Design an enzyme around this catalytic site. Structure first.
Site, PDB file in Angstrom:
ATOM      1  N   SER A 145      65.659 149.900  21.550  1.00  0.00           N
ATOM      2  CA  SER A 145      66.976 150.261  22.074  1.00  0.00           C
ATOM      3  C   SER A 145      67.127 151.600  22.795  1.00  0.00           C
ATOM      4  O   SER A 145      68.171 151.849  23.405  1.00  0.00           O
ATOM      5  CB  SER A 145      68.046 150.123  20.986  1.00  0.00           C
ATOM      6  OG  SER A 145      68.238 148.751  20.662  1.00  0.00           O
ATOM      7  N   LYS A 148      68.157 151.548  26.400  1.00  0.00           N
ATOM      8  CA  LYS A 148      69.531 151.444  26.880  1.00  0.00           C
ATOM      9  C   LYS A 148      69.912 152.705  27.663  1.00  0.00           C
ATOM     10  O   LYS A 148      70.825 152.674  28.485  1.00  0.00           O
ATOM     11  CB  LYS A 148      70.509 151.189  25.720  1.00  0.00           C
ATOM     12  CG  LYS A 148      70.440 149.749  25.194  1.00  0.00           C
ATOM     13  CD  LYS A 148      71.534 149.469  24.168  1.00  0.00           C
ATOM     14  CE  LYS A 148      71.442 148.061  23.575  1.00  0.00           C
ATOM     15  NZ  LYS A 148      70.179 147.859  22.868  1.00  0.00           N
ATOM     16  N   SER A 155      73.869 149.381  19.645  1.00  0.00           N
ATOM     17  CA  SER A 155      72.671 148.743  20.197  1.00  0.00           C
ATOM     18  C   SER A 155      72.881 147.255  20.447  1.00  0.00           C
ATOM     19  O   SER A 155      72.104 146.426  19.977  1.00  0.00           O
ATOM     20  CB  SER A 155      71.487 148.931  19.242  1.00  0.00           C
ATOM     21  OG  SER A 155      71.207 150.305  19.039  1.00  0.00           O
ATOM     22  N   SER A 213      72.913 144.327  27.123  1.00  0.00           N
ATOM     23  CA  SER A 213      71.781 144.741  27.948  1.00  0.00           C
ATOM     24  C   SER A 213      71.261 143.560  28.763  1.00  0.00           C
ATOM     25  O   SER A 213      70.936 143.702  29.946  1.00  0.00           O
ATOM     26  CB  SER A 213      70.644 145.273  27.074  1.00  0.00           C
ATOM     27  OG  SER A 213      70.978 146.521  26.495  1.00  0.00           O
ATOM     28  N   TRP A 270      61.718 145.210  26.798  1.00  0.00           N
ATOM     29  CA  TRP A 270      61.809 146.509  26.141  1.00  0.00           C
ATOM     30  C   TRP A 270      61.860 146.443  24.619  1.00  0.00           C
ATOM     31  O   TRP A 270      61.853 147.475  23.946  1.00  0.00           O
ATOM     32  CB  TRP A 270      63.039 147.268  26.668  1.00  0.00           C
ATOM     33  CG  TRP A 270      64.369 146.628  26.342  1.00  0.00           C
ATOM     34  CD1 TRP A 270      65.208 146.951  25.309  1.00  0.00           C
ATOM     35  CD2 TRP A 270      65.000 145.549  27.046  1.00  0.00           C
ATOM     36  NE1 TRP A 270      66.320 146.141  25.328  1.00  0.00           N
ATOM     37  CE2 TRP A 270      66.220 145.270  26.381  1.00  0.00           C
ATOM     38  CE3 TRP A 270      64.653 144.789  28.171  1.00  0.00           C
ATOM     39  CZ2 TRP A 270      67.094 144.263  26.805  1.00  0.00           C
ATOM     40  CZ3 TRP A 270      65.523 143.784  28.596  1.00  0.00           C
ATOM     41  CH2 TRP A 270      66.731 143.532  27.913  1.00  0.00           C
ATOM     42  N   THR A 280      69.346 155.651  19.262  1.00  0.00           N
ATOM     43  CA  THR A 280      68.352 155.134  18.325  1.00  0.00           C
ATOM     44  C   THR A 280      67.622 153.926  18.906  1.00  0.00           C
ATOM     45  O   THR A 280      68.098 153.274  19.844  1.00  0.00           O
ATOM     46  CB  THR A 280      69.011 154.660  17.016  1.00  0.00           C
ATOM     47  OG1 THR A 280      70.044 153.718  17.329  1.00  0.00           O
ATOM     48  CG2 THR A 280      69.595 155.835  16.239  1.00  0.00           C
ATOM     49  N   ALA A 335      64.665 150.772  17.313  1.00  0.00           N
ATOM     50  CA  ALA A 335      63.815 150.330  16.210  1.00  0.00           C
ATOM     51  C   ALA A 335      63.334 148.899  16.382  1.00  0.00           C
ATOM     52  O   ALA A 335      63.955 148.102  17.088  1.00  0.00           O
ATOM     53  CB  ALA A 335      64.570 150.459  14.881  1.00  0.00           C
TER      54      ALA A 335
END
EC number: 3.5.2.6
Lengths: 250, 250
Positions: free
Chosen positions: A46, A49, A93, A98, A137, A190, A192
Site C-alpha cells: 500500500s 498509493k 488502504s 487504487s 504493487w 503504511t 503490508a
C-alpha cells in the site's frame, strides 16, 4: 548517519528491520538502523498509493471532492465496504479504489510515471494472469528498497518530479496523520503483505515530518519477519517509527 | 378506449393474445385487444426482474457499478455463462443473477415488497422442493395478469411506490431498448416459459414508451399458445408490441 541501534534493535527484535531518516533538502543521513535491510528491495504494497495519488491528481482523474462509490459487494475488510474519498483511500488502504484508478490511467501511462518517479525495479507486469493493472504493487512484480523509497519521498516534497505542484501537495495533505510529542507534524503511509509462497510478512511506514521550526525530513520504517497469520507488520513498523521519532525529538 | 383487433388479430392468430396501452398519468385506456385474456393471471417469468430490480436498488444490495461474477458452471444458455451487470441481467434475462439477489434480500423482505407492489397473487411459496426463494416467479406459484401488470408499471413511472426514487429510475434506465419509428423511446422487459405439465408457452413484453413530446404511456403485450418446443412466445409478444406501437404512431 547516527546509528540508533541501541533504541531501534529492541523494537525490531524478532524481525529483519530497518529505519532511515534523511534531511529533505540536503539528503544528509540523520539516523539509520540496519543499512543492509535498507538496501533490499521488496513489494511496496500500500505505500504505492503515494505514487498512485500523484498520478491520479496529475492526470486530473480525481480531485479532493471525488467520492469513490462502493459497488455493494464484500471486499474482504469491512472498512472497505463503504464510500471513500482520496483521503480515506489512503487512510484505510482501500485497494479497490487504487484498482479503479489504475484502470482509468492505463498501463502505458503508469509505465511512463514509473520512469518519472524512478520507482524501484519498475516492473508492473504482475503475475500469466495479466493482472498487472490490478495487483502489480501487492506482493507481486513491483519491488523497491527503503533507500529507494527515501529518494522518492525526497523528490516529492522537494517538488523535483515532472508532475503538477498541486498533485504533490494534495497527496502530502492526504497523508497527514498527527502531530508528535514536540508538535512535529507527521505525514505517512503504511504498507503490508505476506511474501508470496512463504509465511513471512513485510511491513512499511514511511513519509514526512515537519518540525515546528519548519525543518523537513523524510523517513522509512520497514521490516520482514514471521509474525503469524495476522498481518501486523505495518502496525509494528508504524509504532516503531513514532517511538523513534519522539525519542530523537526532532 | 380503442379496440385494435383489426391490427392485432392477425399478429396473435394461433394463440390467445392480449395487448394493453394506457396513459401513465391519467390511467386512461388508449388501446386494447382481447380484454378476457388481459384479465387472466399467469406466471410473470422474467418480467419479474422489473420488481426484483426495484427491490435490489431500494435495499441497496446492488449499484449500477455492480458486477455479478459467474460461478464457472454451465447455466444452460451460453450468454448466461459470463459476468453480468444490472443492465445485462435485464437484457439477457440472467436467472442466476436474480437468484443471487433473492437469497440476499430474503423471503420475509420479498413478501413485504410484494405487498408494497400489490403484485398479483403475491404467492412466493414455489413448488415440496422448498424452492420458492429461487424459482417462485418462473412458471411456478407467483401469478399476475396483464391488467395488473399495467397498474404496477403505472405506479413505477409515477413514483407511487414506497421505494427510493433512484431505484425506480435506475430500473427504468436498465430497461431502455431502442427508439421507435417516430422517435418515441421504448423501455421494456420480456418474459417467457412453458406452462407446467403442459405443452403451452406463455410470453410477455411490457414496459414504457415516452413520446418525443414527453408524454408517457405503459403497455403490455402477452400471449399463451402452442408454439412448439422452441420458446418463442416473448419474441412474438415483443415483435407484436413494436408493430402495434409503430402503427399507433404515439
Amino acid at each position: 548517519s547516527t546509528d540508533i541501534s541501541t533504541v531501534a534493535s529492541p523494537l525490531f527484535e524478532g524481525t529483519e528491520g530497518c529505519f532511515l531518516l534523511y534531511d529533505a533538502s540536503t539528503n544528509a543521513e540523520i539516523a539509520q538502523f540496519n543499512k543492509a535491510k535498507c538496501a533490499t528491495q521488496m513489494a511496496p504494497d500500500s505505500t504505492f498509493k503515494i505514487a498512485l495519488s500523484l498520478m491520479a491528481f496529475d492526470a486530473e482523474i480525481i480531485d479532493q471532492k471525488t467520492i469513490f462509490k462502493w459497488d455493494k459487494t464484500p471486499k474482504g475488510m469491512e472498512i472497505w465496504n463503504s464510500n471513500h474519498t482520496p483521503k480515506t483511500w489512503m487512510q484505510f488502504s482501500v485497494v479497490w479504489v487504487s484498482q479503479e484508478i489504475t484502470q482509468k490511467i492505463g498501463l502505458n501511462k503508469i509505465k511512463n510515471y514509473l520512469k518519472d518517479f524512478d520507482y524501484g525495479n519498475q516492473d508492473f507486469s504482475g503475475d500469466e494472469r495479466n493482472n498487472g493493472l490490478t495487483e502489480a504493487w501487492l506482493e507481486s512484480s513491483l519491488k523497491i528498497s527503503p533507500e529507494e523509497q527515501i529518494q522518492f519521498l525526497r523528490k516529492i516534497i522537494n517538488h523535483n518530479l515532472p508532475v503538477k505542484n498541486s498533485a504533490i501537495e494534495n497527496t502530502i495533505e492526504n497523508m497527514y496523520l498527527q502531530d508528535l510529542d514536540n508538535s512535529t507534524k507527521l505525514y505517512g503511509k503504511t504498507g503490508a503483505g505476506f511474501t508470496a509462497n512463504r509465511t513471512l510478512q513485510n511491513g512499511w511506514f514511511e513519509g514526512f515530518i515537519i518540525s515546528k521550526s519548519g525543518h523537513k525530513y523524510v523517513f522509512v520504517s520497514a521490516l520482514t519477519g514471521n509474525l503469524g497469520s495476522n498481518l501486523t507488520s505495518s502496525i509494528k513498523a508504524k509504532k516503531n517509527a513514532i517511538t523513534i521519532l519522539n525519542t530523537l525529538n526532532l
